[PDB]
Amino acid sequence: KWWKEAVAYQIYPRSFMDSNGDGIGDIQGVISKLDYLSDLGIDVIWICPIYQSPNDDNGYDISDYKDIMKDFGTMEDFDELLDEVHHRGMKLIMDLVINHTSDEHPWFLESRSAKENPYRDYYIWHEGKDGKEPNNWESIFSGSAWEFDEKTKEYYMHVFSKKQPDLNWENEKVRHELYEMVNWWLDKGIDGFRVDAISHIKKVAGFPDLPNPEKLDYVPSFEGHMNRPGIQEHLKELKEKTFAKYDIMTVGQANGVTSDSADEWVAEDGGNFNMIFQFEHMGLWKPLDLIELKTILTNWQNGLEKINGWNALYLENHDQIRSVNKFGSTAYRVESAKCLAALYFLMKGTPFIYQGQELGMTNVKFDSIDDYDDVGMINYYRIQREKGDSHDEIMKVIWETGRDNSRTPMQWNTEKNAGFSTGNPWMKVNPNYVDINVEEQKSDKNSVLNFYKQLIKIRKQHDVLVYGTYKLLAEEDSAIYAYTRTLEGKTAVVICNMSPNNQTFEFPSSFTNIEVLIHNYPLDKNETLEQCTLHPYETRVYLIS
Ligand SMILES: OC[C@H]1O[C@H](O[C@H]2[C@H](O)[C@@H](O)[C@@H](O[C@H]3[C@H](O)[C@@H](O)[C@@H](O[C@H]4[C@H](O)[C@@H](O)[C@@H](O)O[C@@H]4CO)O[C@@H]3CO)O[C@@H]2CO)[C@H](O)[C@@H](O)[C@@H]1O
Ligand SMILES: [Ca+2]
Ligand SMILES: [Ca+2]
Ligand SMILES: [Ca+2]
């Protein structure tokens, strides 16, 4: 329940704050900015992986689950971070990455050392077929999902990068070691987990070839490992052996789950997580099809209400482009950032703010593939360029869809590197930091940052915005996304002009009192309540008694 009322903030530590001048964010950097997060009103901090890692996938390739990444500091630094977070009235959830390890993890170093050894079946090994890979599956990061090991003459599976071999969840030995490791972290007093790639742990037994109608070199392989039948047996055991023993919050990153199939994931009785990140609204690749977005988010609002589930509300993370670009407008950056904020944040669920979302940070356009880092897009570039795609064609995909857009340094001020670092940042700062930065937004009462501050405040002050039932209004309006939250004798009306144009809208009205809780445009003195004349990306929230 505390997690129902929480507002969460997601830190990408490599890009949050560099405290010692090597261009890489670190834990002491996070500590130095906890005032910022406390003042914002954040309740829960989710920090991306901070464990020992070769950083082939920036922390998601872990070589020691119980040791801190050298780039980020030491276990003392972590203990200090957790102690400071907890003394400032906040909680911290860690990133739990147990679909795969680094290929430099001691388990894998042993697993690959000999065809027979005690760790061989900790991972997924198979001999080739027809002198090629065991099957035609493609890695999510492009290329084959199998990597050949010359020494033992077999392939190992990697859904993600070649340096992220998948763990074998069919091996009871593996599961036992993972549960011990999870509880070791929970025994330290962390407040839960965001659970990485968790819908990928069940592979179709025997790893059969997938249909290949377009005769590709490798076949996108989601039907072989994403949310496959049999996964719930493993997730139920994970919950029983770890999470259920502690008063924590869990949010599973669960691609491949739909609003109709969310029951076993988040239902109040028997769900294996408190909430999940679902992906149905994040793949609508021009004028946004607003009504399609209404349909998806409404499906999840209504769907989880019926099974007493809880939604995780978000538009940004370290795997997506920036939401102004994805859902708003760079022609109305500040206005659409605030409009999007009210839109997603005030639905029923637990809202997550990704670092820089509260500033209206936007996508970046670097010309050189060497300026980027994302293993997925570097791989994509190589494979597609050999296939004849031009540099411009590939950079368009990277610019418009690549997750590096969300990994540029946090923009603190207008000093060198936006104040993120005294050194040369591991990823270049967006040049628009001269216009978009924390320092400037603190002093502007109409900044995106202070709009998020107000959103957090009104959600905390009005129970209807936490527990109120959601209802979509004006479904057929292709520009206005409007909805209500209803609880006892209070109704909140959220009105978002999700368009770059002025629009008219009849107030969807039965009240003894009306109060405007938040608005991103000055109120027009002559304007009547009944006939809204909304500016581009104007949002208003009314509270009705
Ligand atoms: O630790 C390895 C990585 O794991 C985590 O991210 C993973 C997800 O768990 C995977 O499910 C997957 O998600 C991708 C997906 O591959 C890609 O197709 C795209 O998904 C679209 C989807 O196709 C579309 O139908 C709609 O639902 O929108 C989706 C989102 O746009 O994007 C997904 C998210 O990137 O791969 C990712 C890694 O890319 C972890 O968080 C990663 O940081 C980590 O590398
Ligand atoms: Ca550093
Ligand atoms: Ca089994
Ligand atoms: Ca007006």
Per DSSP, the residues of 261-302 read G-HHHH-TTT-SSSEEE--TTS-------HHHHHHHHHHHHH
Tokens for 8, please give them.
């969460």
Tokens for 283, please give them.
């793949």
Tokens for 94, please give them.
């860690």
Closest Cα to atom 19 of ligand 1: 283
Tokens for 486, please give them.
């209803």
Tokens for 53, please give them.
């890692």
Which residue is associated with the tokens 């020494």? Answer: 151
Residue to mutate, 14, 140, 352, ligand 1, most ligand atoms under 8 Å from C-beta: 140
Closest Cα to atom 24 of ligand 1: 283
The Å distance, Cα 208 to ligand 3 centre, comes to 17
Burial of 348 (0-12, 13-18, 19+ CB in 10 A): buried
How many Cβ atoms sit within 10 Å of the Cβ of residue 353? Answer: 25
Reading phi first (left if > 0) and then psi (alpha if -120 to 50, else beta), residue 7 is in: beta
Cα 157 from chain centroid (whole Å) = 25
**Cα angle: 92, vertex 485, 514; to 5 degrees:** 115
Q: Is 82 helix (H, G, I), strand (E, B) or coil?
A: helix
Q: Report the residue count for the chain.
A: 545
**Are the C-beta atoms of residues 438 and 33 closer than 8 Å to each other?**
no
**Are the C-beta atoms of residues 512 and 545 closer than 8 Å to each other?**
yes
| CA–CA separation, 153 and 120 (whole Å) | 13
| CA–CA separation, 292 and 390 (whole Å) | 32
| CA–CA separation, 4 and 266 (whole Å) | 13
Q: What is the DSSP letter of 132?
A: B
Measured between its terminal Cα atoms, the distance across the chain in Å is 25
**Are the C-beta atoms of residues 354 and 317 closer than 8 Å to each other?**
yes
Q: Tell me the ligand closest to 540's alpha carbon.
A: 4
How many Cβ atoms sit within 10 Å of the Cβ of residue 48? Answer: 23
Which residue is associated with the tokens 């910022």? Answer: 36
CATH superfamily, with its number, for domain 469-545: Golgi alpha-mannosidase II (2.60.40.1180)
Amino acid at 35: D
1-101+172-468 CATH fold:
TIM Barrel (3.20.20)
| CA–CA separation, 200 and 178 (whole Å) | 16
Q: Tell me the ligand closest to 527's alpha carbon.
A: 4
H or E segment and range at residue 506: strand 503-506
Q: Which residues line ligand 1 (CB under 6 A)?
A: 57, 60, 97, 140, 160, 196-197, 253, 255, 279-280, 282-283, 318-319, 376
Q: Which residues pair with 289 in a beta bridge?
A: none
**Are the C-beta atoms of residues 292 and 376 closer than 8 Å to each other?**
no
Helical packing angle, 172-187 and 231-241, nearest 10°: 40
**What is the atom index within ligand 1 of the atom nearest the CA of 280?**
27
- Of 26, 180, 183, 156, whose CA–CA distance to 101 is shortest? 156
- Of 291, 297, 253, 260, whose CA–CA distance to 275 is shortest? 253
Residues with Cβ < 8 Å from 45, sequence gap 6 or more? 8, 9, 10, 11, 37, 85, 90, 91, 92, 93
Annotated domain spans of the chain:
1-101+172-468, 102-171, 469-545
Tokens for 171, please give them.
């091996």
Amino acid at 103: D
Method: X-ray
Q: What is the resolution of this structure in A?
A: 1.6
The Å distance, Cα 503 to ligand 4 centre, comes to 9
The Å distance, Cα 70 to ligand 2 centre, comes to 10
Mode of pairing for the β-strands spanning 490-497 and 539-544:
antiparallel
Q: Tell me the ligand closest to 77's alpha carbon.
A: 2
H or E segment and range at residue 473: strand 469-473
- Of 458, 481, 459, whose CA–CA distance to 297 is shortest? 481
Closest Cα to atom 26 of ligand 1: 283
Q: Is 316 helix (H, G, I), strand (E, B) or coil?
A: coil
| CA–CA separation, 42 and 353 (whole Å) | 9
Residues with Cβ < 8 Å from 307, sequence gap 6 or more? 262, 263, 266, 267, 268
